Amino acid sequence: TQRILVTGGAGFIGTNLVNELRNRGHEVLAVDLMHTEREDYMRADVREYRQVERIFEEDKFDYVYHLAAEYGRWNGEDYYENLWKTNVIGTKHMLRMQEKLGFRMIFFSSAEVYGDYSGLMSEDVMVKNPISDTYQMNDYAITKWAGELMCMNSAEMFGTETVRVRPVNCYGPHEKYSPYKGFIPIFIYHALHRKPYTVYKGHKRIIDYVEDSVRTFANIVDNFIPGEVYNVGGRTEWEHDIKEYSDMVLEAVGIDDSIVTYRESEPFTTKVKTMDFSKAIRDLKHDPQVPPEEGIRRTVEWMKWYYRI
């Protein structure tokens, strides 16, 4: 049993991951940007080196899961000061800590680093494909790619031991609605309130249920390979177009699509994210159990409970 730090530990993936790691008997400190009522929790703004160093003055960590971030492509454009300071300077503070202390780190990147690539998003597309294939389309995507490069330069210069993960389209319990969240919680919250929402038809995604993904994220402790990078998401065969996902939300809520406005495609948005999960299947026992239809049913149920509907 390891001592583990989860930054962004009060977020959506963070909350789920902290619970998964604790269920495995790890000792886990959750750190995030606000005070909470949680146990084994500490506020630390990762932009502030003093507050990052204070996390490490208490105890030694074997593993650090670094999720602390400004999340979302349009959040990143609208709040870019917070984005760059948190996602990049915060990551560099974590790397300076890792170079001093020698913990193992799991860096949270994003499938947004593949840009608008139309082919199979294998991890080696960010190695052997022409650079123009994956040009990042928004500041958020660039912060995650800069993070990856900084992790590799730290490894080269100081022998730091880091695994990078590229999460994909995660949904499920502990993801609150806001207008800056992804499509699934937008669709569910709006459908639950009979409020109109837009479907941009011309795109496809693979959605991953958070309970599955954090199982895989937690498996990195059991087979940690310094220098590696993994796409972590659902299954290649779970790819759907956006109307298919909307129709699953509406069916689980029990209404038709009269509240839906159909548009052809969202500008400046990736068309398709056709992921390859073969490396996670190989090294991390990746084996997701909850496909979109069942996952959306569970997420509708959780939001009804959470919002006291």
Added chain:
Amino acid sequence: ETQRILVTGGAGFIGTNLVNELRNRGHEVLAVDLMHTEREDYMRADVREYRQVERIFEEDKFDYVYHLAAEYGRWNGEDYYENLWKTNVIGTKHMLRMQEKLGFRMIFFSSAEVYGDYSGLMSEDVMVKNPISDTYQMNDYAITKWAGELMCMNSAEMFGTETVRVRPVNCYGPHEKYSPYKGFIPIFIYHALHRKPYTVYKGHKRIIDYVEDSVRTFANIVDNFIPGEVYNVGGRTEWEHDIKEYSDMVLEAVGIDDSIVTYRESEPFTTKVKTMDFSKAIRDLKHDPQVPPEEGIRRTVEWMKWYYR
């Protein structure tokens, strides 16, 4: 037509030379930098601070903006990374938000550091068609310049902003003060003029460019501005030399031997060779440097003797 031009980083090395070249052509030029000075047509503005950026534009309308404001140098970037990311990236995003509102034309200062450790001809299209692993940026400073380029291209795509990117290479000459964080030329010159020891890492090659030549090329962008373009600006492909050759030119111009020099094989985490292609600057920007390294180094030795009395 005489233009109204803003130069950020206008009290720095290239900035001071560029402001002078532009004013000599009869442009109206406001210089902006991080400190108060005695200079005329000068304003302090910290480009990290949006309010201070906005204030630059509340007085005057600018036709062209040369954006040089930056934390310069790979080792400076590692040692002062907070300042690096906030100035080089957040500052550039503030300038792009201003460009989106006001519609001025911008020249963005990147770096040949964006080519990483590439061993082939560093043509601009290496950052387009070559495998991404060929040019992985090796330090935070290099990443900030590549991030800036991507942000410029995303602004052009989303808002129709008109930007030319330049990749300066290894610039030297008058108005470059010595510090320990400067590049190899002023380090060699200053130390030699003071009989102070310095190291030569032999296993590298560079092409060095005299600043009065480079700013003539930078000023020429006003006369032929092609939205979306990117140019390497430096000396000539055939001015390539190994580091000992440059040391020997400095020592000869000072009038001493190399007893102050310690020879090492190669500098870790440092690009081996920067074999630049200037064919695009020759085509579009009348690039025609008059001052090769031998003569350039003589003139720079002369200027440092005057400055440091």
